Amino acid sequence: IINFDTSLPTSHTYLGADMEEFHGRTLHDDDSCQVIPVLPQVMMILIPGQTLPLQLFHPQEVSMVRNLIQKDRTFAVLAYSNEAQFGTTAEIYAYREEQDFGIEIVKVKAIGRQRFKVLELRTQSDGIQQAKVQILPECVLPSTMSAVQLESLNKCQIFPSKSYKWWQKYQKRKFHCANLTSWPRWLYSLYDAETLMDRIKKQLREWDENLLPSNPIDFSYRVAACLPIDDVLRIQLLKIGSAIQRLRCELDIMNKCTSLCCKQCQETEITTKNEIFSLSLCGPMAAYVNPHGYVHETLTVYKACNLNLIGRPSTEHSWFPGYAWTVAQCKICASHIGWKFTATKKDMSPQKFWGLTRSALLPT
Amino acid sequence: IINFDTSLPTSHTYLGADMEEFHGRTLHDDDSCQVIPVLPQVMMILIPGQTLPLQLFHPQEVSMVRNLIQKDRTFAVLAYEAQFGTTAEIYAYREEQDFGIEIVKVKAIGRQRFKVLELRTQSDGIQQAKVQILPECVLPSTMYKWWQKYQKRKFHCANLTSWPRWLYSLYDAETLMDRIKKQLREWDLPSNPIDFSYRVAACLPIDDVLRIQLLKIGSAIQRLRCELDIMNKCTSLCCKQCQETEITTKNEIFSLSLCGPMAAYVNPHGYVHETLTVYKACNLNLIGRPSTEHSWFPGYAWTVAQCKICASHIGWKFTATKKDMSPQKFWGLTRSALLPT
Amino acid sequence: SYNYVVTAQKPTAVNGCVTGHFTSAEDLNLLIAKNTRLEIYVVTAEGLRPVKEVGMYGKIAVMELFRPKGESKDLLFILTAKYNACILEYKQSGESIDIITRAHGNVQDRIGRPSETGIIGIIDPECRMIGLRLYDGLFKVIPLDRDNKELKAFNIRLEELHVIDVKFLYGCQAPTICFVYQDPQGRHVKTYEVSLREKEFNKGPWKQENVEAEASMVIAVPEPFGGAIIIGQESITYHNGDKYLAIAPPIIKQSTIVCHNRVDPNGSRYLLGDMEGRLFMLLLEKEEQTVTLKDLRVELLGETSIAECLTYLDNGVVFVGSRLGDSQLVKLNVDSNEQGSYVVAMETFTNLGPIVDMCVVDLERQGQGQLVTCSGAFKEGSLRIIRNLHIRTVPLYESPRKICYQEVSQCFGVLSSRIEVQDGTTALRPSASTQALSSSVSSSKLFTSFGEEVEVHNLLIIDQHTFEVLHAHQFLQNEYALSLVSCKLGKDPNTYFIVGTAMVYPEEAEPKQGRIVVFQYSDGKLQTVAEKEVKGAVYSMVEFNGKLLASINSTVRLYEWTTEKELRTECNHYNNIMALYLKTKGDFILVGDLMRSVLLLAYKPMEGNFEEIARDFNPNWMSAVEILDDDNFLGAENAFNLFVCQKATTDEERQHLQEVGLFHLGEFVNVFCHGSLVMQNTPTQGSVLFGTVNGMIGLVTSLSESWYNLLLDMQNRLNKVIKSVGKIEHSFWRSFHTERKTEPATGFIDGDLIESFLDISRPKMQEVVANLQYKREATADDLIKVVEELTRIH
Ligand SMILES: O=C1CC[C@H](N2Cc3ccc(N4CCC5(CCN(C(=O)c6ccccc6)CC5)C4)cc3C2=O)C(=O)N1
Ligand SMILES: O=C1CC[C@H](N2Cc3ccc(N4CCC5(CCN(C(=O)c6ccccc6)CC5)C4)cc3C2=O)C(=O)N1
Ligand SMILES: [Zn+2]
Ligand SMILES: [Zn+2]
């Protein structure tokens, strides 16, 4: 049973309140080329629709962001594979400068909007890189049946929606004109956005008992961002350009994964895919910032193994309000794997969970 | 040239204000044997007179400290298996609820040496050491112009023994203390040789085993001689993991606090680091941002520093927050990560 | 690449039909839109008399006749799938006939989403406007005043996004639309009035009402009834202000009703057609007071072919236009036969569509290829034999899916499927799989609810002379037979039928089990010689240098025929894509999936494995692929397009296929196959016949650069002389089209346009050929030779 307010983590209140907010989405024509500032120290693959908090202190980046708020509030994040070929543009949607602890630090909450392929990088005189990139479009395809659909029963394309028998009726009625082609209905169902989305929803709910958007594009992006997967497959999903292909690849990757081990000693099983649970409404995994400006892709799980707790619990800068953290590291090789979050009150739930940093784990 | 008030680090103002203090001293008998509680986690060769700031959070440790303020304000710190140790007497204390738990932050000034007779445990998880208070072997007199006449006068009777006049000048409290003080002039005290030797031994960057030696040394003159041998032998300080990455030399060491070049400081999570201040350090890359949070040296901002060959944390770089400060920049190197050469 | 596409068989599937007074004011005319062909016949006592046939530069999506005030005879409004709208008139003088374009335009919106219910078009009974529904939330009105020769149209915002059907109501002084729409509350009828002066909607004459959940059809009843009839799956209801009737006859509960047609001009009788082929009569009972509707009733008139549309001509004669089968002219009697059916078939119009598979065979050992195609679906399934154009039909009464030919045994192996009903299971009709001379059932040891339909799959061995079903082998329960090849494998001298299958269960999404079965047809019977289980569906199979290449889910596998007569693995290749399409030429293997992703592997016999020579991934639905030659690959793409991809010294550039040809065919190509229908033994190299959903067979060949340039210049010269019906640009017609993407045609020559060069009179030929360079200047007498030599390829 969970009663923790799942919208609290998404706010990133640990950064603070009274932050300036902006509205008005800034989009770039989906095939052109542009010049975009690159944030140097963000070693992270950002997927569209995914929040990214930052606390910048280098004068280079601070001056950049001060300039950006007066211009297109957009920068680039390169999906390094080792060396950049693709990336995502992030748009600043919250901002605040402070002079805390003797330096001027600018804290920004940004969001991924568009993907791109990297054409060239140019290191400005400031030590900063400007990326000349070409925007990639989202190839939205129609129904597989729109070309071969029969007109007389085009009236039957609108379904009353309210379950297994319902989906059997759905396959029978939507892909009726599949009889005109050389493939069966069940074959077309493997390329239908709705069936793929429903399959993914069910297959997640198998892991997370208490368990997403409705359009296929956002659904595919969210599923890609919140999976327990390494960097190579992350970039593979990023460079896939169609929602249907992305959903199919996500389903395959979702099926294959089994367990997560400590990266430095690969035989130490930290957890299994059935412990993954979503403590925030943005998904099982999300990107947070610690007090010194390092981004961690924390994955919430119910039970972890071969982890040693270290240090005092602290509710300082907690990413999950109402919980503390104890530094958890592998007991075989003493490498930091994540933190152990515990409730500060009774009547809360879960009283315990583990936030594991993605870069300290290895799927197997 | 230093304008920085050197009495600030010795007071540990990073542990907060309104801390209750306990005036008055409690001391055991010279040879009596007593049983004392042990801090279970802190590993450190505490030397008598040395200040140890602590932040205990474990329920057992907080409970025991709470039951110590009722009794004598003493506990024990073992050398580490442990054959020797030093008792530590609390003199400043506070409890707080900060960030979700009860934590007790205290200050303890090491008082007496002891040799462990037995170690016993309690179900509560803390240990009790039944130990014998080791005494000190105070000795009588074995028998530049001012000191030239001193050497002329004090060591005349050496003609009546089988050793030369000059040799007895190497085993006198005054001459050895003068040589040590003259050597510490560059960096920067108690007159009684016991206290002088204890204060000198606690401010050296030497590895552990040398400190255990000095702790077990039972005489003032011998401890002073060993300290001087070390001050004239230890030439450079290198990365412990590498054993070859040179971090600094003995010429850069300087005393930013009136306690000496080195002192023990507790970080926010109750970890005791023995920091040595140095003007220049090399082979270190700075990680992260500067900050003044919990700064051990007020008016300075720290910056993590680690060995560039192995990326092992060596210490911090303290950079003055305001101009017209002296020194503008320096380094604090944690002794636990160094190795003399 | 330089390709040349021509039509060997025009489309045969009837996608629409209407009846009116078009050619004259007294003759009764039947107008049939097949796909792009408009056919005007005159209704006569003897049947039909075809007066004209015309070709459009677009897929006819809407076709309706109307007579505005002052017009002696009906005009014809047509809309095409690219949103070209035209109003046309039938002008005659003597033996000459031609179609005048009274008005034309393009009525697309640069932004907006096409409906999921499709293009809907209607005409007000008083001809005060034309109403279209193309995108969600927008209702496009075209005023019909005679000054609107450009068909200027304005949108109106519809608050109800999900509109099902719409009609114009009769007996209204203000143009009124009655439409059925769906919301989370259910489904409701709603009426609006249309104001051209204010260019917007007003409240309709009678209130919104709730109707059946699956109500989907609207009929506008003429005077004196008026109102409307809403038809769903359970009930037929009638709404007219206060008056409200409803019936729930049990005879319509089995299948959905997908077409209708008014029989009497006063609206007392209607013909209704269900999905399965049943034809009903709906009768409106009249009471005199004003005249009000008394009651409704439905009478099952009989069974026809699966009707795409109906139209009552006269004297109890009804034309049934069918997409899945042959179109019909049927008689309607007053009393039923001994079988209880009022419907008698009179004439049948051949329909080859849908062509789902086909093969080229020289049955008569004559050097002239013949084409055997699998046509139709459900009870309309058939085999067609097409030769030089003569067509012979062999009805199966079940769906044929795949077909191959075995010369050593002189028989065709046909995969087929039939639908049975769980009751065990029971059939719905006798078919080929149940009327075979001999039969068998799969007995492999490897590996519901009442009234439901279940698919039973069979392999039929059919003789090549009489086309009798020699044998019928029924596969396992819940087994889908996907592929079928006839080949020799390894050193064995015997020929086999190899069938790849999959085990499909509703509870599973992606098949995990399948089989490769090997049959030998010997001495009149069929026998399983081997059977290899596989962990995936065998989507396709080919013969590869005496081995068997099979596509199992996302894997490609090479099998060898061992002396013990078992299939032994040789090598596997893994892809990111399901290998639905698997083509082979030489040692090169082309692998495609449904999402236009193309891959080109090669076989290294010494190394004995597969490596990726080239790749071209681009999201779009792909319906077929072919190998034109070592370098060029042909394919059919969504929105009825053809593409041709081509295989710098740079590894990255060399590994990328470059699209060198784009074309808009206006057809959904189901199958490609190498062959020809003309006497073997040119200016053209190669011959690929392709078959489509609408029954159109086409030919693709390859040209030289000289010929390509000459014919392209001819095209540009002819597009200036030929008067296109509806005044649509040929270059616009053939532009490669896709969702919010449009490119000019490249790499292809429209062979129909070129071959039309002979039809134009000699003065127009002189106009066309002027200043064209043959390095001599060309003359019409030379271009005649060129076009005749091009025409003699089919
Ligand atoms: O819910 C949650 C989960 C936990 C998470 N937290 C809190 C936090 C606090 C601090 C640092 N630090 C990371 C950098 C840092 C390292 C230690 N430091 C030395 O000097 C030093 C280095 C080596 C040895 C001895 C001392 C200071 C600088 C401090 C990181 C974090 C972090 O990830 C969070 O915010 N909320
Ligand atoms: O003048 C001075 C010199 C500096 C000195 N300072 C400040 C300080 C602040 C914090 C910690 N920490 C030590 C323990 C700590 C480690 C980081 N944490 C994780 O969660 C984590 C661990 C690994 C990877 C990622 C995150 C939180 C817990 C925080 C240690 C120190 C310390 O020595 C001081 O106080 N003043
Ligand atoms: Zn480990
Ligand atoms: Zn080192």
Q: Is A311 in the pocket of ligand 1 (CB under 6 A)?
A: no
CATH fold of the domain at B173-234:
Methane Monooxygenase Hydroxylase; Chain G, domain 1 (1.20.58)
Q: Is C217 on the interface with A (CB under 8 A)?
A: yes
The Cα–Cα gap between C120 and C16 comes to 13
The Cα–Cα gap between B87 and C673 comes to 96
As beta bridge partners, residue A296 has A288
The closest of B120, C252, C576 to A241, measured between CA atoms, is: C576
Strands (E), C605-756: 609-616, 622-627, 632-637, 641-646, 658-664, 669-674, 685-692, 697-702, 736-738, 741-743, 748-750
The SS3 of residue B318 is strand
The Cα–Cα gap between C671 and C279 comes to 33
Count: domains in chain C? 3
Helix (H) or strand (E) holding C487: strand C479-488
CB within 8 Å of chain A, chain C residues 314-373: 323-324, 354, 356-357
User: Are residues C642 and C699 in contact, defined by beta-carbon separation less than 8 angstroms?
Assistant: no
As beta bridge partners, residue C533 has C515
Query: For a pocket test of ligand 2, which of B14, B57, B101, B269 has the largest count of ligand atoms closer than 8 A to its C-beta?
Result: B269
- Residue with CA closest to ligand 2 atom 15: B269
The closest of C451, C513, C509, C519 to C477, measured between CA atoms, is: C513
Method: cryo-EM
Residues 6+ apart with CB under 8 A from A316: A291, B99
What single-letter amino acid sits at A257?
Answer: C
User: Are residues C39 and C61 in contact, defined by beta-carbon separation less than 8 angstroms?
Assistant: no
The SS3 of residue A222 is helix
As beta bridge partners, residue C122 has C131
Q: How far is CA C77 from CA C122, C129, C376, in A?
A: 10, 12, 30
The closest of A361, A357, A212 to A286, measured between CA atoms, is: A357
Kindly list the protein residues that place their beta carbon closer than 5 angstroms to ligand 4, a single-atom ion. B 239, 241-242, 245, 307, 309-310, 312
Alpha helix (H) ranges present in C110-167? Answer: none
As beta bridge partners, residue C648 has none
Nearest 5°: phi and psi at C652? -65, -45
Q: Is B330 in the pocket of ligand 2 (CB under 6 A)?
A: no
C-beta atoms surrounding C273 within 10 Å: 28
Q: Is A95 in the pocket of ligand 1 (CB under 6 A)?
A: no
| A148 neighbourhood in chain C, CB within 8 Å | 668, 693
Residues shown for chain C: 794
The Cα–Cα gap between C671 and C690 comes to 5
The DSSP code sequence of B143-185 is --HHHHHHHHHHTSGGGGSSS-TTGGGGS-HHHHHHHHHHHHT
User: Are residues B315 and B283 in contact, defined by beta-carbon separation less than 8 angstroms?
Assistant: no
Q: How far is CA C344 from CA A23, A154, C280, C308, C331, in A?
A: 69, 29, 14, 18, 5
Task: State this model's resolution in angstroms.
Answer: 3.1
The Cα–Cα gap between A181 and A267 comes to 50
- CATH code, domain with C782: 1.10.150.910
Residues in A whose CB is inside 8 Å of some CB of B read 57, 101-103, 105, 292-293, 311-316, 324, 344
CATH code of the domain made up of A12-135: 2.30.130.40
The Cα–Cα gap between A199 and C617 comes to 25
Q: Is C575 on the interface with A (CB under 8 A)?
A: no
The Cα–Cα gap between A137 and A116 comes to 9
Chains contacting chain B through 3 or more C-beta pairs under 8 A? A
CATH class belonging to B15-133: mainly beta
The Cα–Cα gap between C749 and C352 comes to 25
Tell me how many residue pairs between chain A and chain C have CB atoms under 8 A apart.
121
The answer to whether B173-234 and B239-340 have equal CATH topology is no
Q: Which domain holds residue C728?
A: 708-791
**Backbone region of residue C767 per phi and psi (left: phi > 0; alpha: psi in -120 to 50; beta: other values):** alpha
The SS3 of residue C355 is coil
| A312 neighbourhood in chain B, CB within 8 Å | 57, 101, 103, 269-270
Domain extent listing, chain A: 12-135, 191-257, 262-363
CATH fold of the domain at A262-363:
2.170.150
The SS3 of residue C730 is helix
CA within 13 Å, CB half, C406: 25
Give percent helix, percent strand, percent coil of chain C, each to the nearest 5: 5, 50, 40
- What are C515's two structure tokens? 């089989």
C-beta atoms surrounding B96 within 10 Å: 12
The Cα–Cα gap between C586 and A45 comes to 43
The Cα–Cα gap between C108 and C506 comes to 41
Domain closes at, from C682, C707, C732: C707
The closest of A39, A47, A52, A28 to A86, measured between CA atoms, is: A47
CATH fold of the domain at B239-340:
2.170.150
Is residue C403 domain-shared with residue C254, that is, in the same domain?
no
Is residue C366 domain-shared with residue C461, that is, in the same domain?
yes
- What are C32's two structure tokens? 């049939």
Q: How far is CA B129 from CA B69, B76, B90, B118, in A?
A: 19, 8, 18, 6
Nearest 5°: phi and psi at C115? -60, 160
The Cα–Cα gap between C776 and C772 comes to 9
Q: In ligand 2, which atom is closest to the CA atom of A290?
A: 26
User: Are residues C503 and C479 in contact, defined by beta-carbon separation less than 8 angstroms?
Assistant: yes
Question: Order of strands, edge to edge, in the sheet holding A259-262?
Answer: A269-272, A259-262, A361-363
Omega of the bond prior to B327 within 30 degrees of 0, cis? yes
The Cα–Cα gap between C206 and C785 comes to 68
The SS3 of residue B285 is strand
Q: Is A327 in the pocket of ligand 2 (CB under 6 A)?
A: yes
Residues 6+ apart with CB under 8 A from C607: none
How far is residue C712 CA from its own chain's centroid?
A: 29
Residue A28 CB burial class (10 angstroms; 0-12, 13-18, ≥19): middle
Residues 6+ apart with CB under 8 A from A106: A55, A56, A57, A61, A62, A65, A66, A95, A96, A97
- CATH code, domain with C282: 2.130.10.10
Work out whether strand C138-143 and strand A105-123 pair parallel, antiparallel, or are unpaired: unpaired
Q: In ligand 1, which atom is closest to the CA atom of A296?
A: 33
Domain closes at, from C707, C738, C761: C707
Domain closes at, from C707, C738, C757: C707
Query: For a pocket test of ligand 2, which of A327, A335, A354 has the largest count of ligand atoms closer than 8 A to its C-beta?
Result: A327
| A143 neighbourhood in chain C, CB within 8 Å | 116
In this structure, whether the domain defined by A191-257 belongs to CATH 3.30.420.40 is answered with: no
